A paper describes a structure:
Yellow fever virus (YFV) is a re-emerging flavivirus that causes severe hepatic disease and mortality in humans. Crystallographic studies have resolved the structure of the YFV E protein and shown that its domain architecture is similar to related flaviviruses, with three N-terminal ectodomains, known as domains I (DI), II (DII) and III (DIII) and a stem anchor region known as the transmembrane domain (TM). Here we use a chimeric virus platform to resolve the first high resolution cryo-EM structures of YFV. Stark differences in particle morphology and homogeneity are observed between vaccine and virulent strains of YFV, and these are found to have significant implications on antibody recognition and neutralisation.
Exhaustive domain swap interrogation between bYFV17D and bYFVES504 revealed that DIII is a key determinant of virion icosahedral assembly and FLE mAb neutralisation. Similarly, all the chimeric virions in the bYFVES504 backbone retained their parental virus phenotype, except for bYFVES504/DIII17D, which most closely resembles the smooth phenotype of bYFV17D. Next, a cryo-EM map of bYFVES504/DIII17D was resolved to a resolution of 6.5 Å. This reconstruction displays the typical flavivirus architecture of 180 E proteins arranged in a herringbone-like pattern on the virion surface and is substantially better resolved than the bYFVES504 reconstruction. We then utilised the symmetry expanded local reconstruction method to resolve the ASU of bYFVES504/DIII17D to 3.3 Å. Similar to the bYFV17D:2C9 ASU reconstruction, M as well as the transmembrane domains of E have not been resolved. Exchange with DIII of YFV17D allowed for high resolution elucidation of the bYFVES504 virion structure in both unbound and 2C9 (E-DII mAb) bound forms, demonstrating high similarity to bYFV17D. Conversely, there was a significant increase in neutralisation of both bYFVES504/DIII17D and bYFVES504 T380R when compared with the parental bYFVES504.
Numbering used by the authors:
A (entry chain B), B (entry chain C), C (entry chain A): 1 to 391
The structure:
Amino acid sequence: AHCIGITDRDFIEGVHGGTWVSATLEQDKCVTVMAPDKPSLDISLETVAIDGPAEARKVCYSAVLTNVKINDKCPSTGEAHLEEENEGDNACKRTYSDRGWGNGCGLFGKGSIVACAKFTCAKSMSLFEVDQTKIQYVIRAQLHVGAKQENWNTDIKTLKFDALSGSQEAEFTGYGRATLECQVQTAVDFSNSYIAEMEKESWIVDKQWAQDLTLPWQSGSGGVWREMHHLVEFEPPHAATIKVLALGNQEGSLKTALTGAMRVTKDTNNSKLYKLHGGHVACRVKLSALTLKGTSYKICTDKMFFVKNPTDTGHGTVVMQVKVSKGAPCRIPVIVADDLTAAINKGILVTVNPIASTNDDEVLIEVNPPFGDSYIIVGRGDSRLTYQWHK
Amino acid sequence: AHCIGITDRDFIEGVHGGTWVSATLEQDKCVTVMAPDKPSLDISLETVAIDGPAEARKVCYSAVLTNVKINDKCPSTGEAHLEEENEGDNACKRTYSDRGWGNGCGLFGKGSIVACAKFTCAKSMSLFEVDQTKIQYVIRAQLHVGAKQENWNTDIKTLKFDALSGSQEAEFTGYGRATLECQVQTAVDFSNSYIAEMEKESWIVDKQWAQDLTLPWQSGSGGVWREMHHLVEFEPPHAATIKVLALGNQEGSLKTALTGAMRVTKDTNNSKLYKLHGGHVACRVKLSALTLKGTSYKICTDKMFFVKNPTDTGHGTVVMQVKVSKGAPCRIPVIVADDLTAAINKGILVTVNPIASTNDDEVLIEVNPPFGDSYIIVGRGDSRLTYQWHK
Amino acid sequence: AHCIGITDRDFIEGVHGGTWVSATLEQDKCVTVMAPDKPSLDISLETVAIDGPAEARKVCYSAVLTNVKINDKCPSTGEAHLEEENEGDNACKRTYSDRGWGNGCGLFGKGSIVACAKFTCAKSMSLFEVDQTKIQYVIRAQLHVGAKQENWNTDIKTLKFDALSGSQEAEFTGYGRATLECQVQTAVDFSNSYIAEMEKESWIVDKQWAQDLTLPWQSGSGGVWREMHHLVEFEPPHAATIKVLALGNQEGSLKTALTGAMRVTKDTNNSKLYKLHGGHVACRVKLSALTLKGTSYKICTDKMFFVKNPTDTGHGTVVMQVKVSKGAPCRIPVIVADDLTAAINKGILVTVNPIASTNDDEVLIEVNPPFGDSYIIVGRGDSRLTYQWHK
């Protein structure tokens, strides 16, 4: 079951005869819900997904400024203006200046100068409103049947939760069913946030922070740009003229500020599906309807062999694969004990009742051994498998 | 001597044998200068004026507001925008308004609204930039020839002053010449100020105040009205509509604030001459080129008449008119005394040498009497006129 | 001269027995240098420049990665390796992915990952050396000719200065000579710095600061980027996959850091010719060889008047321009009194003997009346062009 492959693994044990076991899930992590007479259930949060956000704003982070014009008025001869001031994309600025006593000047002091330049956005990030009702939480659930790793990707049941389907049944063929309830409404605070997007790149950002950006922005339906000041500088006026510059691409600064946000991956297939990293959710599992498949079966009592020897795992837990050699739809007895006399089975099975359901069935088994050295033991009689182990 | 009629008058006496006599003149006041053997001279400031100043700004004080347009978007979706936001002559405001299923929304959040309206100035104050080198000055000057009042408007000399005309000559047909050194260009007491104008009314006001004035204003050459929010008001939005209103005419409030300023009149005839009701002049007068007419004339030998009896006038001086019936090309002996049997020339003539030109010519004579009880005497011998006077 | 219009100016004045008057020049300042028996001098600094300085570095701010590839090996199976790890144009990271049966490894544990991408630069910032032996200077000066406004077109002397020489001589026709000695080599601030250049913008940057940029950089005409780390990030490995990204264009952050460095402007008539800013040169000037052209001529004392009447100006002189209608070749006197008697004087002329060479032209002249009220007087005799002034 797929939790073997995840580094952060939590074992959660149900109290005997209890029904509802709570767990908390996070995308780097998985949980193996485990209960005393029922096969263990691996559960993990695969993704949080957001479908069809609405474009609220675009924020420009580089501007190709073009077609500057300037006009000027001599001291106490009036005040200057430009036709471009009547038009919203010209980003104009107005200021006094000194002016030359040789330049038709009347008197010492200040002339007046006005300049305008056609601001156009070269690159912008898009800010999307999160359609909070649309959020899907996608859960993987997989039962410890003892399926070999090749089969995990087909055996995993995938469940999608949103507020319309807060309860779901995972049904496992022959093992019964488990009911999941997940707290989709509580787990995230996307009400006060935008998805922020850049070329091939995306983030989820605080709605205040993204409004408070000192950058020129556009109303998402494509209107005027609204605060040109944050990208256009005018060099303090020369007596005859004033000269204008665009600031550089703020992309490097803007990504620097974004580093604290949760990253988002835009899907490969959908145009407008956004998958969100690091989101988490709480769930409860009704284990009660799960059952062991083969508690009816006879004990294998026949030659067995390891297809993969018991390896360690980071979980302090041993994983092995066993094939029953012949003639037996049967349950494989597994012990781990201090002595080859196997006085007491100190270790705990995670594959709570391992079964070879048919003569070819390659059975994965997971066992949590005691600390210290001990012997894992499989099968019975003259043909036991054994393997020395250490904590 | 038109400064008989002017209400505020200063006499000034030239130092005996000083070629230049100092004087100062004010917008509705007169100096009359006397020197011990020269005919007395009236000098008066007719106007301080500026011809064709440049308009710096127009300031809207009533606006009509038309073609209101609104765009509204539900709280889930993006920022609202209008085409009108790109046009300079639209006053426009952006705000967020409560919405819900009463308005066709999906969600109950704060929707977005923008509303723009076409702004047009109905009436505006014009601000004209003064420039002290452009100030014209005009001086009215007249000798005490003793002409009747009906002749004063032709005998008054008009002297015009500007940056070039730094000194001027007045020539009086029988009485020689004087020249004025009016330092008018520095005598002014205003700077960095606008002539402020409304229909048939005008003012002069501080530049910085008129820039601080909280009203929409326009560059003198035209173009966009650029602080429209000081006349356009938006009533807070209802869920799908916002009501935008122009404020009423501000001219009462505006000229209330102007009430403390010095007044100006646009000329009754000229296109662009503005006359300023203040300022003052400093001057000096070269009197030594004046000569008393006809002192070699014979004395009146025969009967005379008062035709306007001597009267007081507020300057503390006496004015009379006398007709010469016969023997006319003669000087009229004027004496003010206090011992009628043995008269002495105790009082001081302002009409320093009165002469008749032709039979039944009527002269005017102004005389400054001594303190106390006194006689004013005109003519000689038994047919002389005599009049009682006091203080 | 032309320096009247400069935003700020300073006064230095010598006395007889003194010589070698000290001065300081700055690239947009001016000084008036004066001496009692000799014409006043205006001085200013026109350009500091360097021609074709040497390449120090290029610093990249916009990496483009391509052709990434990866090698991965199971735990306890040695170290992964890539040929790209061993050649210059590939950035690489070597690290470990946690792996197990879920990822095709036979054992559970950390297996090594290495990944490399081809690195190319879309843009980079050049750093050029301050080749201080090549630091060109150009120095501007003029004497107080008295010439009217436009003649500044070609009257101004402007002088090349260089590390090749210490001093240069002014030649004034009719006004003698002067020597300016500049210590050109040593005044500069550029102890350890580079010309930093981006496309169409440039800066003078601290050498150590520039070397200490957290950015990939290349020596001269190199073939390798001597650091590559700072623009490449690797998202932590998942199974056998690791994915590599360029950071965004740092240009905006870099210009943000460069803000507050001294500007540079490249010229266009020659490539790689750089005008600096903030240039400095402390100098001394030998005034003793200067002379006045006209001191022996007679005073004008003829029909004369203002053509640009006196005004203040921002550095504290009074400036005026005047005409004699016709007269002799003569000197125009100006004197400043505190009474119209003009026999007692206190103000200073900076044009000491302005020259009316011929009748058809004006002279532009300057004066410094004392604190408080004062009279400017130009001409003498009957042409009493009196013009009052205050502070």
